[PDB]
Write an enzyme that holds these catalytic residues in place. Structure first.
Site, PDB file in Angstrom:
ATOM      1  N   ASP D 145       1.731  -2.210  -1.394  1.00  0.00           N
ATOM      2  CA  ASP D 145       1.951  -2.684  -2.750  1.00  0.00           C
ATOM      3  C   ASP D 145       2.603  -4.068  -2.639  1.00  0.00           C
ATOM      4  OD1 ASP D 145       3.022  -2.971  -5.463  1.00  0.00           O
ATOM      5  OD2 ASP D 145       2.742  -0.720  -5.811  1.00  0.00           O
ATOM      6  N   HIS D 218      -8.450  -0.269  -9.705  1.00  0.00           N
ATOM      7  CA  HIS D 218      -7.271  -1.001 -10.158  1.00  0.00           C
ATOM      8  C   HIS D 218      -7.394  -2.496  -9.838  1.00  0.00           C
ATOM      9  CE1 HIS D 218      -3.182  -1.723 -11.294  1.00  0.00           C
ATOM     10  NE2 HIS D 218      -2.806  -2.032 -10.065  1.00  0.00           N
TER      11      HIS D 218
HETATM   12  C1  HEM Z   1       0.907   2.321 -12.128  1.00  0.00           C
HETATM   13  C2  HEM Z   1       1.660   1.863 -11.148  1.00  0.00           C
HETATM   14  C3  HEM Z   1       1.062   0.754 -10.358  1.00  0.00           C
HETATM   15  C4  HEM Z   1       0.758   0.918  -9.030  1.00  0.00           C
HETATM   16  C5  HEM Z   1       1.205   2.107  -8.204  1.00  0.00           C
HETATM   17  C6  HEM Z   1       0.112  -0.262  -8.575  1.00  0.00           C
HETATM   18  C7  HEM Z   1      -0.322  -0.460  -7.273  1.00  0.00           C
HETATM   19  C8  HEM Z   1      -1.056  -1.507  -6.811  1.00  0.00           C
HETATM   20  C9  HEM Z   1      -1.621  -1.636  -5.523  1.00  0.00           C
HETATM   21  C10 HEM Z   1      -1.524  -0.636  -4.395  1.00  0.00           C
HETATM   22  C11 HEM Z   1      -2.297  -2.832  -5.477  1.00  0.00           C
HETATM   23  C12 HEM Z   1      -3.077  -3.413  -4.302  1.00  0.00           C
HETATM   24  C13 HEM Z   1      -2.182  -4.261  -3.342  1.00  0.00           C
HETATM   25  C14 HEM Z   1      -1.565  -5.438  -4.015  1.00  0.00           C
HETATM   26  O1  HEM Z   1      -2.249  -6.499  -4.047  1.00  0.00           O
HETATM   27  O2  HEM Z   1      -0.436  -5.338  -4.511  1.00  0.00           O
HETATM   28  C15 HEM Z   1      -2.080  -3.464  -6.752  1.00  0.00           C
HETATM   29  C16 HEM Z   1      -2.594  -4.702  -7.084  1.00  0.00           C
HETATM   30  C17 HEM Z   1      -2.372  -5.251  -8.330  1.00  0.00           C
HETATM   31  N1  HEM Z   1      -1.791  -4.701  -9.393  1.00  0.00           N
HETATM   32 FE1  HEM Z   1      -1.006  -2.925  -9.511  1.00  0.00          FE
HETATM   33  N2  HEM Z   1      -0.063  -1.080  -9.627  1.00  0.00           N
HETATM   34  C18 HEM Z   1       0.470  -0.554 -10.764  1.00  0.00           C
HETATM   35  C19 HEM Z   1       0.521  -1.099 -12.048  1.00  0.00           C
HETATM   36  C20 HEM Z   1       0.090  -2.378 -12.360  1.00  0.00           C
HETATM   37  C21 HEM Z   1       0.106  -2.989 -13.649  1.00  0.00           C
HETATM   38  C22 HEM Z   1       0.653  -2.286 -14.876  1.00  0.00           C
HETATM   39  C23 HEM Z   1      -0.457  -4.257 -13.543  1.00  0.00           C
HETATM   40  C24 HEM Z   1      -0.669  -5.369 -14.484  1.00  0.00           C
HETATM   41  C25 HEM Z   1      -0.280  -5.377 -15.723  1.00  0.00           C
HETATM   42  C26 HEM Z   1      -0.811  -4.390 -12.160  1.00  0.00           C
HETATM   43  C27 HEM Z   1      -1.348  -5.554 -11.611  1.00  0.00           C
HETATM   44  C28 HEM Z   1      -1.801  -5.664 -10.330  1.00  0.00           C
HETATM   45  C29 HEM Z   1      -2.381  -6.898  -9.881  1.00  0.00           C
HETATM   46  C30 HEM Z   1      -2.556  -8.194 -10.629  1.00  0.00           C
HETATM   47  C31 HEM Z   1      -2.774  -6.654  -8.611  1.00  0.00           C
HETATM   48  C32 HEM Z   1      -3.442  -7.610  -7.647  1.00  0.00           C
HETATM   49  C33 HEM Z   1      -4.994  -7.617  -7.853  1.00  0.00           C
HETATM   50  C34 HEM Z   1      -5.753  -8.636  -6.951  1.00  0.00           C
HETATM   51  O3  HEM Z   1      -6.153  -8.370  -5.815  1.00  0.00           O
HETATM   52  O4  HEM Z   1      -6.001  -9.783  -7.279  1.00  0.00           O
HETATM   53  N3  HEM Z   1      -0.443  -3.252 -11.485  1.00  0.00           N
HETATM   54  N4  HEM Z   1      -1.335  -2.607  -7.555  1.00  0.00           N
HETATM   55  O   LIG Z   2       0.778  -3.620  -9.164  1.00  0.00           O
END
Ligand code: HEM
Ligand SMILES: [O]
Ligand code: HEM
Ligand code: HEM
Ligand code: HEM
Ligand SMILES: [Mg+2]
Ligand SMILES: [Mg+2]
Ligand SMILES: [O]
Ligand SMILES: [O]
Ligand SMILES: [O]
Lengths: 305, 306, 306, 305, 306, 306
Positions: D145, D218
């Protein structure tokens, strides 16, 4: 039964050596301090765990032993014996108590020293105080790795701690100290190969010179002793650099622990008086001893009462 | 831009302060050393990267400047001014060169000091040598956290480095040193609450006492100065404990860097001479200054190019 | 011969304490888990060696022992004895199993807790869960160093591990837990000198107050016991701060291990019921116990062979 | 204008504190806001350089209007509830946010204690979460993450208000949501199915290729390009939290951006879906139980009160 | 005890394995080196203490033993036995001396290997040289945590060190080595669940699969052996990844120590020849052994005194 | 700035250097990989933050540039120029792509190398693969500290990064690689003093020999170059030891970055062809170059937009 002091310490990069004499009338104040020194060690050091590695080893000299205690004496405890060699002399200088304080940082050493001397104000007179620092690759003031052949683990317990041969004092040890000053300008005029011939090991790699090329008057040759049965006689050393650039003092503070002073004293006789094959230890052509004292470091239980 | 010396160092827990005077005839030997001191710093320190954090800041006094160099002088460079207060005195003592050597371990400091003094043997006379050590929680000899309000980052660059106001010497700084000895027995007879009133901050938690309760003669009150600008006037300090238990010496080695000595000199006036509301800084009732010198620490390029 | 659990752990900076009761019918599930808990400690911990220092000590209560096992009981196992002092009360609260999980980081503790509770859900009901953290330089929530006089090395083994007095259970230990909540407002209204009089040691330097000056109702005075033979009776403690800022809970989670519960129970009687010279331990005027339980922590081989 | 420490180094511990301002509490709050940087230094300085303690303070839309008069940040409004066909993003009360981060929890807790000590009787706690890094930057679903967060100048440009709202340059907008996970349901998926929900490989953290990454993963739904073809980015510092006894396993989401429009677009895509995707599959295992929006002013704005 | 070599080493993240044959005429050179190998270990390692954790374990093969020494042989010492299974083969390859060099950094390994081979130049012929590195969560080249179930403490001493059953050689151990190369493309085509069925543990969390689902032909099932008394027979392993990306070599260097080779040999027979329940260990469908040797690693005293 | 690659890395103690040629037909596969190489660096590296310090610098050769890219070429890009000196020769060897992978541990380097080569399988042919490790005190295989006089901070940025002299390629750099094998037997037959005369610095203390004693054909004398301007011309080196004790290969992998190849090439001509006062660099009497290639390392943004 007996809990030793922290004679076998981890590697520590800082030390304070404090040598004092007990003034007339001071014996009771000293006795009180000795019974608390372990709890001072914990007070100053516990909060800096686990990196602090603070310890204090307390030693008592032969004349002071008689002033402080009656009953049994440790079998090996006597005043340091002067050696008047043809060329070099090992002096004996006054000293009733030794505090060998070690840690990973000088400030912890200083904090503990401050508490100890605070309790002894008015009862003792300082004779020597040295703030030691190890160089970052375990090198000494002469540029050589220092400590390589110390015993470790069980070999070290066997070499340093009094056992069944003097059972009332089991868990104790005998410490010899000498403060050495070096002639650095003379030392630095030797080539590395010449320096290696004085010590007995290679400078950069710390590999021992082979038997066929190691001089008889090298430091390692003269401080290798075998006992009656042909086993090696060992001590545990924790030599520390010290100095002052302004006063041009560059020094090695020698401290050697052993289960009997006879081992340390034999090494000293070989170094200063020589053998059939060697006039004296070549290291002494660059190193002058300006202090010399012998102490018994009792088991920690002995001090707790 | 010019490269400054390492005035803004990371936190380091050991230091050597060396103050020397230049003997008759010594100037050529000194000039040779000054032009190599950066390469000695790298020779001793590079092999101990990244933990060693060895640096050396070299400073030159007012009289020495004129023996060593011709051409312009830094605008603020003058001898340290004695302050003869009603009770306390800030003394002036001789010093032509300052080596402020810092690292994470004393041995590195000592190795570099050895090389510097080796090159100067026979040209200089030692006036002071102090081996400093920080206590493990950034505390000083009085038991208080020391360094908290130092400026950092850009605010620090702006407070410490000469700029366009003296453009030939941009990237330099001005260092004041004073060695203080403490009366620890007196200090330890105060309660913690009394000690807090002398400093101006809480001992255990390092929180500043509020404006409504901090005394006018507390250290923090007197060393807070605002300029005509309305802005706070800041210095960068790197005070270090030192001592000897056998001689009962417990001390603080003060060193303060600023873009002009006027800031540091104002603070010293306030401490020693007092204000309308304060006789003197209460810290001086437990601390005696026994040295006092002022130096200019030029940009690194100035020294290299000799 | 016998392998104890990791009662004698290095210093660790995170802990989880988990206390559960065994539901009716849950005994088989629990016995299965007990025989695998060492496996789980390795599964979670091995990949973070050597820095993780993850351990789990598992303890069983007096009534649970009779539900789980037949045959010999450890000699000292009984329910925690409630202490009804004139002012202060040590409550006994329910607890069949203790998991005392420690590591250098909380994630490892949590991971192992999750695996343990995963196997046990449906068989147990959580009674208490506390996430503890080390606070500065081994300080507790009262601002004092906590652990200084613990025994170490050989003296620790002798104070903590059952030996030939109860040979079927040699290598076990008895654990007493009590969760304490502090009145921080009252405590902070004391001067440091008054706080030092409650504890019996100096606050900043952790030096014990001398015999001349240490009050008889100080914590250190009351928890120092000499046994019939003149020697000190020692326990091993690993107290952990915990809290929540928004609920104003500031706590000490007390856990003490001893080779017999009688040492710990004597200390508790002195603190809560007093002596001839001291009504009660002054620390209890700023500390309320809200849990209290006693467990036997068997040798590791006892648990493996189920 | 100097920003608060929105761009922090990686930190392994955090406290998130959300409070509401009681009637009459405005002056106490304003005094605290002008001291919060001083408190940060007092608690953190003695643990330098390892401690990495920082506190970012944010102010909600309704609170802004009670505390200050004059011009308001251009994007500041109450969090917008999203009522999707299946999943809902709730809005919950919050006037002030303290996002406290360090390399150890104790530093976080010491600073939180000081802040809440000054606010006692002026604020009411709404939410307090103690977060911890789980292993090798993993979250509670077992995925790394943080990987695609922007760094360096790209991060400064994505998160800091600039010339588009010049009176507030150096500020940022933070959205928080506390999520609870249904771990039992999640662990019933195979690893390959889980990877299809997230859009990256579990063990190696390599992104799935464009030809196999689902539209409702996601990573697919939170990738947004602007009208000029550049990526719209936010800075996240999500933290695990939980309680094993209550079977609560959570992710505390915090996302910073120079305008709430970026974050809000991502949220709409996740909750309300697109042409090709009903909603973000991560929400089939994740329930939001809080939702708030805050403006985090430049540090000078808070100093000058 | 006699003092063993450092068979029980802390976790180390780098290793060099060196296997050589002794040339005709080379015996006396080798004997001289054996008697100095401990002092070389200290020379190279001391200056990097305590973090270096450099150790060297030296082992001697069956045929070489007879060339070098007269008198007693270790009871278990024989040439590695080739296993020609229905599908998979464990080859036997030449080797007289083994140097198993481990440290926290490769450079220490390399420096010690340089000194050893410098003394042996012209007396020995290199047969195998592998530079191993641990992945950062103790994972191997197949992506699984490797080492979890190794014994520790007293259980380890009892499993690995010769005792009174061969009292002249007490403190020695037996080492088996095999170099394995992996078919990574095939392995990566399995699902994680399928890989877990090959190994017998969960990939991410390293929890053992329960008895009801773990296949009989999984690696963990076939390398679990119980002795006459119902106790597990254990070995100590320190497997290391190695490879070359350009040559597409991805490997595991297996080394297993035991107090008698019979334990290790039983495990190998089960893996390669199979049992009634299991054709062979499924790990071998992704792993090919290209070396195989057996060595006796004497007590350190034995080497010193000759 | 445009965003450069991580040419200016922190100190790292492990490296993999991978040089490949692009097979014909392979250009599309390579262009795809170039556009993802930054995201692979993050995928492998992020989970090991902050200690891993994994970086990959990607370099493209002169002939490969022409096959891969549409329009303008960096001004200084050409094939490495062979140097045919009277005694020693700098060879030019094939290389289209360089991956210079560094980290605090070799496993991270290997994991990233594996991922890159995985994507390039079938489109490239390996030419060279070197696994490098730093000696514990920044020493090279000749026993000398290596890196001391590298530029730092701003001076490094200015010596290494292309600026407004070639504005479409600003933020790139030029890398020269040469793999050197040493004759350690010869070298160890020299006294320390004679070795110091070859290098130009003291061996133990790393202090530069003074001008009146430093030979003209010492390495340091020949690689010190002043430009037209009076000022020093600098490069940024990250030399790595490598080798194999069994094959007696003891090597230094030279890599030097500069904002134009002219600086590096001048230094090379001085070493191999000599000057008025020096036949050739004495270091070449103990060092044989067996590879030699030149690459342009574009700004990060250039690679991302493909
Ligand atoms: C529900 C709990 C959440 C979990 C467990 C979670 C987990 C993750 C994981 C594992 C990744 C892929 C690795 C990384 O690039 O960080 C990711 C990417 C991302 N998450 Fe989340 N996330 C959550 C909620 C959110 C929310 C609410 C948003 C935006 C409002 C968000 C925005 C993003 C963005 C922008 C990326 C990067 C996408 C890219 O590769 O360009 N996340 N998240
Ligand atoms: O995230
Ligand atoms: C006598 C020995 C000295 C000691 C032990 C000492 C100690 C301290 C302490 C504990 C603080 C509070 C924490 C901090 O911000 O560092 C402090 C602050 C300070 N001291 Fe000193 N100090 C000494 C001498 C001086 C001198 C001579 C000066 C100026 C010439 C000075 C200038 C300052 C300044 C400017 C501050 C920060 C005030 C602000 O809060 O904005 N100190 N000192
Ligand atoms: C290709 C070679 C190998 C690989 C990659 C490998 C990998 C592993 C892994 C991942 C484990 C599970 C975790 C652990 O407890 O370490 C394991 C366990 C084990 N391996 Fe291997 N192994 C290999 C060869 C061998 C060989 C040749 C033997 C025996 C001669 C062996 C004996 C064991 C033993 C005894 C266990 C522990 C079983 C238990 O749980 O009791 N391994 N190995
Ligand atoms: C066998 C290959 C090489 C070895 C072992 C080697 C070793 C060294 C050593 C020990 C130093 C002194 C410490 C330092 O400043 O880093 C040094 C300096 C240097 N080397 Fe090399 N080097 C090699 C090849 C090269 C090559 C091929 C070049 C240029 C194309 C080069 C350029 C330099 C430069 C510029 C310096 C710094 C000189 C100064 O300004 O003081 N080296 N090298
Ligand atoms: Mg559930
Ligand atoms: Mg098959
Ligand atoms: O020594
Ligand atoms: O200060
Ligand atoms: O294994």
């Amino acid at each position: 039964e007996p809990e030793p002091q922290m004679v076998l310490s981890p590697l520590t990069s800082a030390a304070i050596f404090l040598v004092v004499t007990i003034d007339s009338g001071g014996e009771d104040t000293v006795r009180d301090l000795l019974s608390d020194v372990a709890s001072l060690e914990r007070a100053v050091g516990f909060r800096a765990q686990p990196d602090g590695r603070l310890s204090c080893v307390t030693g008592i000299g032969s004349e002071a032993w008689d002033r402080l205690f009656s009953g049994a004496r440790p079998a090996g405890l006597h005043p340091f014996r002067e050696l008047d060699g043809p060329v070099h002399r090992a002096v004996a200088t006054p000293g009733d108590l030794l505090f060998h304080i070690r840690a990973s940082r000088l400030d912890l050493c200083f904090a503990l020293a401050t508490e100890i001397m605070g309790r002894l104000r008015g009862a003792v007179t300082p004779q020597d105080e040295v703030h030691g620092f190890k160089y970052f690759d375990e090198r000494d003031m002469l540029g050589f790795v220092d400590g390589t052949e110390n015993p470790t683990g069980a070999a070290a317990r066997r070499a340093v701690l009094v056992g069944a041969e003097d059972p009332a004092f089991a868990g104790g040890s005998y410490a010899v100290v000498q403060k050495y000053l070096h002639d650095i300008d003379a030392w630095e005029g030797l080539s590395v190969e010449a320096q290696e011939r004085v010590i007995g090991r290679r400078k950069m790699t710390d590999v021992e010179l082979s038997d066929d090329v190691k001089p008889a008057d090298s430091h390692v040759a003269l401080t290798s002793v075998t006992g009656p049965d042909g086993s090696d006689l060992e001590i545990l050393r924790d030599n520390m650099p010290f100095g002052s650039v302004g006063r041009e003092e560059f020094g090695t503070y020698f401290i050697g622990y052993a289960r009997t002073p006879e081992v340390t004293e034999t090494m000293l006789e070989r170094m200063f008086l020589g053998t059939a094959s060697a006039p004296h230890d070549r290291i002494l052509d660059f190193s002058t001893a300006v202090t010399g004292s012998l102490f018994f470091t009792p088991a920690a239980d002995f001090l707790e009462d």
